[PDB]
Design a binder for these strands. Structure first.
Ligand SMILES: [K+]
Ligand SMILES: [Mg+2]
Ligand SMILES: [Mg+2]
Ligand SMILES: [Mg+2]
Ligand SMILES: [Mg+2]
Ligand SMILES: [Mg+2]
Ligand SMILES: [Mg+2]
Ligand SMILES: [Mg+2]
Ligand SMILES: [Mg+2]
Ligand SMILES: [Mg+2]
Ligand SMILES: [Mg+2]
Ligand SMILES: [Mg+2]
Ligand SMILES: [Mg+2]
Ligand SMILES: [Mg+2]
Length: 95
RNA sequence: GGCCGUGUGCCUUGCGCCGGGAAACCACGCAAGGGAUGGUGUCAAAUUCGGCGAAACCUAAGCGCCCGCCCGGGCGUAUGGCAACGCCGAGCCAAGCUUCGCAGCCAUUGCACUCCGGCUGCGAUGAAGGUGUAGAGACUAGACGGCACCCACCUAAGGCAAACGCUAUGGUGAAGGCAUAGUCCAGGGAGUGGCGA
RNA sequence: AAGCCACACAAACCAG
RNA sequence: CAUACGGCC
């Protein structure tokens, strides 16, 4: 379902075969139509595989991303999005 | 093939010893013997270039002594040389391991911000051990070699235990592979030709 | 000298 | 005990 608003969004249920360095650019171009993107974290580890965190400059870029991109097929797989349960280390150094 | 001897590598015993180790025991220095040194699989590849050392042993230019002197000689000696062998820089290497890529399958629906699941497959780099290092050398093979286990003996740090204590990822079960076993091919056996003293 | 290098070469044997 | 060296068979 949904959680409570955040600067960063939690993306899961991805295709686990797409490589780290390739996927970043496939995310930096597709989501930049909501606003500016700060950083995209992707790990291929057993725990973090098929998961991605996308950090925007403002909430407006992330809130619309939750609605406009909910269910979008990405490499023949549905894209599930939730709000982040924590604030990113990239964000914590400013506030 | 045997018997005596010298050297060097070896192990055992009985000595020394601010080294490492928790102990076993390893390493170090020497001296006297040859009684002893467990097992099964696996790996067979690279085998290039270039420097550093050696004992006995063989020989005697130079130099020393001597045959009173020269002419010959004689005696000592390595600094010359053979060579068991001890090793250094660079390049390459099989399987087993450290770490990385890509592919393949099995898992995994997982909230991270430091990196990270397991296999089998090539390719890659790490640390061993090789190789260079045979009588110039060519080639087969397993071993005394690299590797995983297996067994006997010793110790027990850590882990286990209330506890006498249990337990090996720690020791001990030699060195030989500067060619070991083989089959070749140098070499001597057995010729002249230089160089050398 | 001991030994080294080049060419030539018959055996069993010795042969790292 | 192994390698190599000096003798001897
Ligand atoms: K000690
Ligand atoms: Mg014996
Ligand atoms: Mg070959
Ligand atoms: Mg003289
Ligand atoms: Mg004279
Ligand atoms: Mg003499
Ligand atoms: Mg000498
Ligand atoms: Mg050499
Ligand atoms: Mg060789
Ligand atoms: Mg060898
Ligand atoms: Mg041989
Ligand atoms: Mg001859
Ligand atoms: Mg030899
Ligand atoms: Mg030998």
């Amino acid at each position: 379902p949904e959680t409570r608003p955040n600067h960063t969004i939690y993306i899961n249920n991805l295709n686990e075969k797409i490589k780290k360095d390739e996927l970043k650019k496939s995310l930096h171009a597709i989501f930049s139509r909501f606003g500016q993107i700060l950083d995209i974290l992707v790990s291929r580890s057993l725990k973090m595989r098929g998961q991605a965190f996308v950090i925007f400059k403002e909430v407006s870029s992330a809130t619309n991303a939750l609605r406009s991109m909910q269910g979008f097929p990405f490499y023949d797989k549905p894209m599930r999005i939730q709000y982040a349960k924590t604030d990113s280390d990239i964000i914590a150094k400013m506030k």
